[PDB]
Amino acid sequence: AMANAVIGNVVTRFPPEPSGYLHVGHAKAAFLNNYYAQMYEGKMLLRFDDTNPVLEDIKYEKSIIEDLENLGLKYEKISYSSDHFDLLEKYCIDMIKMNKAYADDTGVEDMRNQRGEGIESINRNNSIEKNLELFNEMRKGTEIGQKNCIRAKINMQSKNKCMRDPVMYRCIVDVPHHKHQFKYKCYPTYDFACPIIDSIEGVTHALRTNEYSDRIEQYNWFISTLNLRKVYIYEFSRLAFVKTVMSKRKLKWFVENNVVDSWVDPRFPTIKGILRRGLTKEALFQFILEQGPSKAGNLMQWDKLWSINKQIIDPIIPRYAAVDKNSSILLILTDLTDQVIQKERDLHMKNKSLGTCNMYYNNKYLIELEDAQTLLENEEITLIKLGNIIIKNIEIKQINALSNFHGDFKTTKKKIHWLPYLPQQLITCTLYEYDHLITVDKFDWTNFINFNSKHETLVYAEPSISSLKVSDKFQFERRGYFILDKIDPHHHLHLIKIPDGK
Ligand SMILES: [Cl-]
Ligand SMILES: [Cl-]
Ligand SMILES: [Cl-]
Ligand SMILES: [Cl-]
Ligand SMILES: [Cl-]
Ligand SMILES: [Mn+2]
Ligand SMILES: [Mn+2]
Ligand SMILES: [Mn+2]
Ligand SMILES: [Mn+2]
């Protein structure tokens, strides 16, 4: 819903916590806020939701910004929740002075169960000036102040657990804030800060994953009680996948235990990781647009996302060939000579926009051991993109065959790929095939870790693959889809298999 949205006057905002790397969960949010803003020719704010102190190992803002650019999402302005602390304090005092907030020194268990059973706590009827004295205590971070929090005074008998005096401010004196250090001793809560900040920042349409509770009634109460400009708020379903560890504790465990090497490892749910695994932002965004709502708590399968991605990339990438380097066996076309013939072929047989490549042939070829051990004497097979041959004797250590290129491809059922036996021009490559880090769909947990989830293979590839640049995607004939990840000394390629949904 873009309720009462007006063309040219919509402002949304994407509000990630600046305390971690962007991961695919953020995906939906980042896109939908951009989607709706473009639908209405409006603006999308980027607000780092730094409302409470969190110990950070790195300033994550740069990472988030870079990933957002890598998704084509552009935003009008960048703010911090923390930029409104002074304003938020002002409003908190106004709340106290309208008798719509009180200080409460009741304990956490007691408070939780009085909210459960609906008992208004003793302090609910404090005087305004007592509430003010206590709030200043919190602002100062004294003993008393740390004993206290500020709650909204709504309705403890309400049907909705979120309207029974939610907490608005808290006193945190020991954890530093990633921007203001220990300058603030009290901090607003998410529930109090979000409506206020959206309102004063110009947001017309706040978008939020459904948290299964009716925070909406609360949001709205805050906005009306304070007499602020109204913000519409639409809840959409969270996007989460199976076999995906999204918990920072367990992610850090992986990283510090050398199960992965960085937070950008392709088995990780970070945006950098999944792009590195070969996903297109087009695929992800179309997946989001096409998936509809999801019951709170449901996890999606990866297969549809990768199938979308395959349909996207299949028509716009070159097709090259590669064989297993240590097990490839030699096939000799005994009627030809070792003169090296070079023919122009098309990089895509059905998309000449990608252009041409050079193909080399000789009397000597490299074919797959599986393909090889499938052959039979006097069997006429097809070297793809080249022509047909008839096998003579399967010596498997060698295969001898005779050329017959001018015959038709129709009468042939076996159509194998190949590499010209030119070791000084064949390109050596490492293929990485990744698997999920956990064996289960959701959560003694480390006993479900797939430790051997990075399979490496050495292959030879056509010389023309040298033309590829880092991050290029392509297809290996009868092998699958890959993305160039790294170029090494002596043009050794590191290639990551892109899942295809099958
Ligand atoms: Cl609470
Ligand atoms: Cl939804
Ligand atoms: Cl955690
Ligand atoms: Cl790595
Ligand atoms: Cl086949
Ligand atoms: Mn920071
Ligand atoms: Mn010769
Ligand atoms: Mn010929
Ligand atoms: Mn495996």
Side-chain angles (χ1 to χ4, degrees), residues 2-13 33 36-45 76 198 201-206 229-232:
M2 281 294 92
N4 304 103
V6 178
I7 288 271
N9 289 114
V10 163
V11 177
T12 71
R13 83 286 181 280
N33 288 297
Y36 288 122
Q38 308 229 76
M39 172 192 295
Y40 276 91
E41 315 205 79
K43 292 170 201 155
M44 186 188 115
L45 306 183
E76 208 250 322
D198 288 345
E201 275 196 341
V203 177
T204 65
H205 285 83
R229 190 202 40 104
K230 197 134 296 164
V231 188
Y232 300 94

Side-chain angles (χ1 to χ4, degrees), residues 247 250:
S247 157
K250 307 196 184 97

Side-chain angles (χ1 to χ4, degrees), residues 260-294 296-303 305-310 312-318 320-342 344 346-348 350-351:
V260 299
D261 280 346
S262 55
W263 282 72
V264 197
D265 179 288
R267 287 161 295 186
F268 261 37
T270 65
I271 296 311
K272 281 221 190 60
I274 190 140
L275 292 178
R276 189 164 169 242
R277 186 107 167 243
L279 192 55
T280 66
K281 81 196 176 257
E282 296 77 35
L284 179 53
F285 295 158
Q286 185 193 130
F287 177 81
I288 295 180
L289 283 177
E290 271 178 6
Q291 214 45 35
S294 97
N298 261 41
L299 302 171
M300 318 274 100
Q301 301 282 306
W302 293 89
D303 300 276
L305 174 69
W306 291 122
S307 310
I308 291 194
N309 193 70
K310 173 193 161 296
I312 316 273
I313 69 173
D314 201 8
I316 65 195
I317 59 178
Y320 298 93
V323 298
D324 196 282
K325 162 159 183 148
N326 294 331
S327 86
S328 58
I329 54 94
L330 185 70
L331 160 59
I332 320 181
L333 295 198
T334 72
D335 60 331
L336 308 190
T337 71
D338 56 301
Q339 204 205 16
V340 163
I341 292 112
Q342 177 192 120
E344 267 196 43
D346 269 344
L347 270 167
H348 200 316
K350 281 153 293 185
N351 180 0

Side-chain angles (χ1 to χ4, degrees), residues 69-73 75-76 78-108 110-111 113-116 118-126:
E69 163 66 327
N70 288 346
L71 293 203
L73 310 178
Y75 31 78
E76 208 250 322
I78 297 176
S79 65
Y80 293 67
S81 275
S82 86
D83 298 339
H84 311 295
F85 280 170
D86 298 332
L87 189 51
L88 281 172
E89 300 193 357
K90 184 241 167 187
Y91 273 120
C92 175
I93 279 148
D94 296 351
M95 295 272 297
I96 284 165
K97 294 184 178 175
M98 309 159 43
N99 201 239
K100 292 289 193 111
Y102 57 99
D104 198 353
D105 60 18
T106 311
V108 301
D110 292 344
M111 191 171 289
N113 245 343
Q114 313 182 335
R115 174 179 283 123
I119 294 84
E120 325 183 334
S121 208
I122 165 65
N123 299 279
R124 196 162 135 115
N125 309 97
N126 282 6

Side-chain angles (χ1 to χ4, degrees), residues 18-19 48 50 56 60-61 80 177-179:
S19 178
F48 293 119
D50 58 343
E56 86 184 357
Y60 289 106
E61 288 94 311
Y80 293 67
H177 186 272
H178 78 104
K179 255 186 106 74

